[model samples]
Target chain A: EDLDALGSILEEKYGLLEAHVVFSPTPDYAGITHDLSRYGAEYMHETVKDGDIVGVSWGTTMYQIAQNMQPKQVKGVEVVQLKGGISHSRVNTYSAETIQLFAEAFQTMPRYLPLPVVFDNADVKRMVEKDRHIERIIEMGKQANIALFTVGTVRDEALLFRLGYFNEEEKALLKKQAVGDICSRFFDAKGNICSSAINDRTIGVELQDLRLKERSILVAGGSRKVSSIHGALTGKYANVLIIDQHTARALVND
Target chain B: EDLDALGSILEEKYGLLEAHVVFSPTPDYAGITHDLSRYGAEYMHETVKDGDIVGVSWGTTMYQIAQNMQPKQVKGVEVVQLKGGISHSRVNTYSAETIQLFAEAFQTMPRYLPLPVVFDNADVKRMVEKDRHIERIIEMGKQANIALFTVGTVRDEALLFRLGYFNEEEKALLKKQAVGDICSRFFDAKGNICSSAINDRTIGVELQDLRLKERSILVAGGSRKVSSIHGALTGKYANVLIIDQHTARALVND
Candidate 1:
């Protein structure tokens, strides 16, 4: 009921940016940060309490978030990665390194997503998900009170899409759909998840699953990213958003 | 005397990366937002204040710094672009855009640098410098109390470099000399401005010009950039430094 009230308030007060901050009512409010450190601060302030569990994503932006998060005494809180960071780009300095940077920042163990985010076969994804430890991590991700993530634009060669999240053909498909991404998954203009075809095979938590979390904070900015931000907020995928002024104005104006 | 002492302390305590925060002596710290409506608590702590004529160099990182600066009601201050942001890039998203961002963040008018940060010929540089308008901006850069800049790394796509500061061949020559960049100009590891067969043909504020400033703060990071950072700090070019952990550790270890 409170979540609905909050969502209603956002819908009335700050309608989702056809490309900016939006609220998707999972079970509760969505929080956001404009910059990486500020995003991490959202996590630090809300999701991370004395003993609260926190799950983090990886990227240059995420690394910056971690850099800003100093070694703090969080009581008995476990920090873990929701997915494996391995990828097809062995020589390309893949997601694992970025994941490692995030783990280092939390002063917690970074559980490597031992399997590639994208696999050659659906069966391979199934097989990897069957691993007991990974199953446990996924369970942990589901159980956590908070989730921190960044929205990505669908242009090719980014860390995720390049690392097997989207095959060359799938990338072409996204371009055709005029889609941008969240946590490495694609969405359309209205913020709806576009492809059931490929996303079904994804190993990470589904956007809907993310919605169910108690607190989900999404951080994104840059004028180049407006369209994607709009899609994400409208999709009811993120409940709260943190962004910069120019982009915020764009969201309000356009 | 204070600037030199600050420089020595930075050299000793921080060396390359050993220090997390370094101070730059400003001629006057002005127009910085450190108030409730302005400075977010985090930034209020790091801001430049009244009467300070701050010098800013143009780049993505500098823009990030400017973006994070707390919004405040500040007066009796000046914000000046230390170097020209105009480059060959069709995008006017140069240093001036960054300065404008900083100025707008504080709700102030930005004093611009009219000179080309890079020139096609020494003759052109001389010609540009002779303009009364450009001369005024150059004078502002010299009059700046605190200079803010980030070290440009050696990459194939040096946007600033391509703006004609140095051609591919010129960069290659500097690379051969084990040189790095300071304010878009090449310098050896020892901080000596590596004279290229072509350097005499270029124009901008000289390294000697930077030395005359009250405070020169250098912000640089990336582990691959440790040596460049080393070269910059050792070049005795920066009186203060702000950097990432990896580079900081590398500064001490390397």
Candidate 2:
């Protein structure tokens, strides 16, 4: 019943520096996501300061929040894409649109990491990122003062599962071990990276790098995402979080 | 100074279905391209009707035309990407933004190709496009009644030269033999494809498909693009042509 109490429990239990729990009278997927985005945008806006660089991940949840973020002309603001959005994946994560919208919110151009999120060969990944543009963008993402993202579930129908890099054997192994992912990096329920091989092939802001950001905000909510969100918190990947009341209650009980 | 006479000569010389040439007093690159895009957009708007599908290629010239295109609400109008836009290249053609803007002009959605313009292996190219979404978009592109594009020069500094699919030897050979490219397909001054091997790796609406379009419009200008544009005309890729007076004069003289 106490959303604030649950928020406090998350802070104390998982060591989240700050967390906000929200609710909507009409709580379906659409309505709940809408409410979550509105609150997420507000919290994100509060975190901004003049000349700050904001790094963002891409997903449906991230896209909704980007749309909900009203324009604010903060001086010298630059938005950097925290992960490469390209995938031959079945699901349209609205990747390009997400980073563009995020930059538009601050009246800036997005510094896109124009490479694949996952590579077939890890050696190829290193070689590809060696290009001046890709190298610069990756460094910029790492240097970003503010980072925003959402943890992804390891469910069968999850967006990452449909993202088309995994072979049958890899998929089965990951399904058994990983609880969720952040920036395409899979992690177990105890908040440890599940596969060293998979991690080497993936590119973006590293999980350990999240701990160093001035503001590392993770925004997500859904009954299906409870375990992933909890795992993210356990990993201390986010200093600030925005989640829904239903999911909040579930996190508290767990 | 007779622009219409020049247009007529170009039509008769290259057997173009129609050609329109315009002059701008300002005559600088920016001013010339601005007028070119204005005329291109107007002609493009006129070509569209109810139930029309438009296919578009990506480049600075194409992006200019797409931006100049005003909102026109047409029923059953679909905008499909004529070429795969992804490249590990230096130039930013505004590929995603271009198709999105084109679709918005007609109040519809863009069907993106969402793949690389050139693949490392020809067989891999075939395999990638076999996916239902890519296959459907390619077919839709071929079926689109109206198509818009611009020729790319084979000059050392041309956008296509910087697009990175070519090896040092390939670039040198093309420089020796080819005049230009359209949709990443290289061709000689006489409009014969330069290399069949390179053509095998390219993914797009074939030059032959351009000949079949109801309104195949090629919008381009600038002195540097003259040879490329002439080669495109020689190839009979477009039914309609939009040119600047300066370039028109050069075409007539050649």
Candidate 3:
């Protein structure tokens, strides 16, 4: 909590209303992501109150939030899927498992969107969305007052890139121009949509929708997701950004 | 089991692809609706195979079907919400609980529609449907191959009638022309839409859409739901209907 000065720098620079900088001293005991999840869980559990629909996206740290939950019974709560989580790659989305845990922790029925993270054609994407199951989850995410999401990088090893969702040409282009992605929609360093083509194909709560939430809590750390986190911050997508010491230092480094 | 002759009569006359006439010998140990659920569950349990999306609506017997579960874990099974269950009045839809039981039996994530069974205005109904969560469930219901639903009557004591959904004027009209309701959309004896006014405001799987299912299984009983059941049969909405001994006899009499 002594990193208040650094946290304030981020609050002004990224137009954040609140930023939490974890006090750093210890090393490999719990790892950065786990520590992020520990603090993130405390912030989230306390942050989420009665009658809030918590929207969530997926990742390693996203999965860890469930383990660290010191549960509280908040009434009339619901969980909404922020985006489609079915992965196209051999990799696991781990989202279904994640939602079940969140539902268990919150004591609410999960509103899950059972769909792919990205679609090949926007028309087919819209076509599948004609299914009310997909539409309801998508709309629920839009209405979610509280958001819990982590950003994805522009690296070739990026889960989004390797998901087999994009062709090589688009993948190459994504690495060149994209800094990060929020809700599977990639954006440039300036926070503009990197590929309008891919954006149309994307389903879930869009980037602009993120800014509208009461709390768009961005949780990501490490050097890998740093730029994506910064771009997400620049876009004013997250009012509350939670991060690790190394990554926290990197955000203010430039 | 000896009601084969009568079952054949119903099959040919009502254009039903299949009809089952439950044998009656015992007394109050099992009521007619409970008996209907027993037979309905048997048929349903057998009819549902791997990869089937089972759509369900709620009623007395609909609740019993879960109690009679002989679960067979089918692969790729999903339970899609046939309609929104939250009733506007004090009446309970029992839909969320039903969907949970169905999910437990089917071993799949529950695709639930969390809106009211009927909306006040058609525009508002559509407005809510515009939410992706509502849209996905509706579309999933449409895609559901096997449907489990019970009919509602126009009688004053009818669950739909007493549910306080309609104004007195509309209630009087419903009592006059409407023979039955499927998914809360009232239809005449000929299975044609009765109150286009009410139908517009209604949300869920539409009446016409019911016939599109691979197995639109209508299960109802008692003299109470008899007329509605008959009209539903005439409408060709239920290709496979499982009904009580008393009502089955009434359907083909004279």
lDDT of 2 by residue, A171-218 (tens): 987899988999888888888899889888777888988988888998
lDDT of 3 by residue, B194-234 (tens): 88888887778887887888899888777776678878888
Question: After superposing candidate 2, which stretches have Cα over 4 Å from the reference?
Answer: A87-92, B1-8, B11-55, B64-94, B101-148, B151-217, B222-240, B244-247
Native-to-model Cα distance after best TM-score fit, residue A221 in candidate 1, in Å: 0.7
- For model 2 the local lDDT of residue B124 reads 60
Best by TM-score: 2
Best by DockQ: 2
Q: Candidate 2 chain B TM?
A: 0.94
DockQ of 2: 0.13
Candidate order, TM-score descending: 2, 3, 1
Off by over 4 Å in 3: A1-15, A21-41, A48-146, A152-176, A195-214, A222-224, A245-254, B1-15, B21-41, B49-147, B152-180, B183-185, B195-214, B222-224, B244-254
Provide fnat values for all models in the order shown.
Answer: 0.00, 0.02, 0.00
DockQ of 1: 0.01
Q: Chain A TM-scores, one per candidate? A: 0.76, 0.94, 0.93
Ranking by lDDT: 2, 3, 1
Q: What ordering of candidates by DockQ runs from best to worst? A: 2, 3, 1
lDDT of 2 by residue, B98-205 (tens): 877788888787776655566666766665456444567678988999999988887788765675667998889889989888888888888888988888877788
